[model samples]
Target: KEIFLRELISNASDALDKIRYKSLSDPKQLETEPDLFIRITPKPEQKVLEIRDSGIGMTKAELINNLGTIAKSGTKAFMEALSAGADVSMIGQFGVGFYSLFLVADRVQVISKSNDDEQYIWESNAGGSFTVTLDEVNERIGRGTILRLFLKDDQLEYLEEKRIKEVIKRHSEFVAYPIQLVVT
Candidate 1:
């Protein structure tokens, strides 16, 4: 439960970071869309939870470094031993929280399209390796990141729409995007 919330919040933070970075380069980007915020939704009925944002998506290297490393990132173990003295456990600032999805999700579907690169979908079961190929869902996805979380049996609470929204709102309400509580 701890890792689950941490990763989700990290992603939200990353989304805001992207916007900030982009805004640094393109200051007028937010002029039309200023309310960009994180949206969390859980579907216990379908056993899925989605964390989405209107920020940038992953690059080729990001895909490999992010999802490709979950099964190996030692942040989980290192985080377990955290104490007041070892505040440096914030090591994930190096971009390690992406893997936390594996803490709960068994199957993951990321439909993302970056403006600099062509649109693509990343699918994985969180194991030895993952495949990243060009996807043809452009008609559906927009210009941001959509993280669809296929929940694990033990992490079902995150699948409840209200529960998921509460978690995000409680932790990430101050984010830059609108955190929607979706149910379907």
Candidate 2:
């Protein structure tokens, strides 16, 4: 339980890191955008938990390699470069930190968009193989990543706002980005 919370928070942080870097490179990245935040929404009928972010999004290769074959060794060393408190160059370092998702989600859907990049939706059952497709949402939501997790029946407790808030508070409070529980 604690472990899944860690993975969830880590993923949110990763998504936050992505947009933040791009914004750094191009200060205009957030010309008319709001500060980054993660919204965890529950869809009971669909049995899904959607984690939406308003940060830098992933490219096709990034979605593949990161969620695919890239092992996350040297991650601590890589992260150290970011944590040194001086240079923040190596912002998005290694990939292993992403595998933490498998701890909870059975099927995952990643919807992302980037500057000069077409929108993409990447889905996976994490059975060692997955799929990606070109698509558009009803309305563009800006650059970021949205992760939808198909929850196990027993995991329905996570659908509760208070429960999910507790999980986020326990694992992700002061996470550098505000985390919200979205219900609609």
Candidate 3:
């Protein structure tokens, strides 16, 4: 996959940036990790890639609206919105980042915990829609989003630590926050 890690890491970094920005005005937002980090875990046996971020996690509603709404705005529509000066600071302003996960993942399960919302799980095969459910386990994440990428068989190359780090170094070196690949 060409530049896929770049987008994934960038999205993580963007999430971190969102939290950092909020912390400027509200210090408690950074309670989880004063020095936030993006944790990447590769489980080849399970054919999975996990990317976790200590950032502004999504609420149950946000998980649905943001990931479920595909192409809610076309490039042309976005241009017009830009001309109209709409606030497009969100990463998926054009609604494509969520779909990008499908490039390497056959399915994605997002487990998120937001300060104002309870832990929730969002899952999708990236066909046309997604589903959200309350995390009934009482498992608290404090604040963050864990994206578990269920890899398609052929996409197993992503499980190698060397390969993951190579791609991260090549494309995500510029990411403001530290990105660490943790193999467990």
Best by TM-score: 3
RMSD of each: 5.2, 8.2, 6.7
* Candidate 1 colliding pairs, count: 5
Predictions ranked by lDDT, top down? 3, 2, 1
TM-score of 1: 0.71
How would you order the candidates by TM-score, starting with the best? 3, 2, 1
Write the residue-wise lDDT of candidate 3 on 4-45 in tens digits. 665677888877899888899998888866768888899888
Indicate the worst ten consecutive residues by lDDT in candidate 3: 83-92
Instruction: Return the clash pairs for model 1, or none.
Output: 36-176, 36-177, 37-176, 37-177, 37-178
- lDDT string, candidate 2, 1-184, tens digits: 5345445656677767766777787878765355688888888889887878877777788776775553333243443443435322112354334444443456778888765566788877643567778866534667777878787667776566777777777766548777778756
The TM-scores of all predictions, comma-separated, are 0.71, 0.73, 0.78
Global CA lDDT computed for model 2: 0.65
Q: Model 1: how far is 51 from its true place, Å?
A: 0.7
Q: Least accurate stretch of 10 residues (summed lDDT) in model 1? A: 82-91
Error of 1 at 115 (Å): 1.3
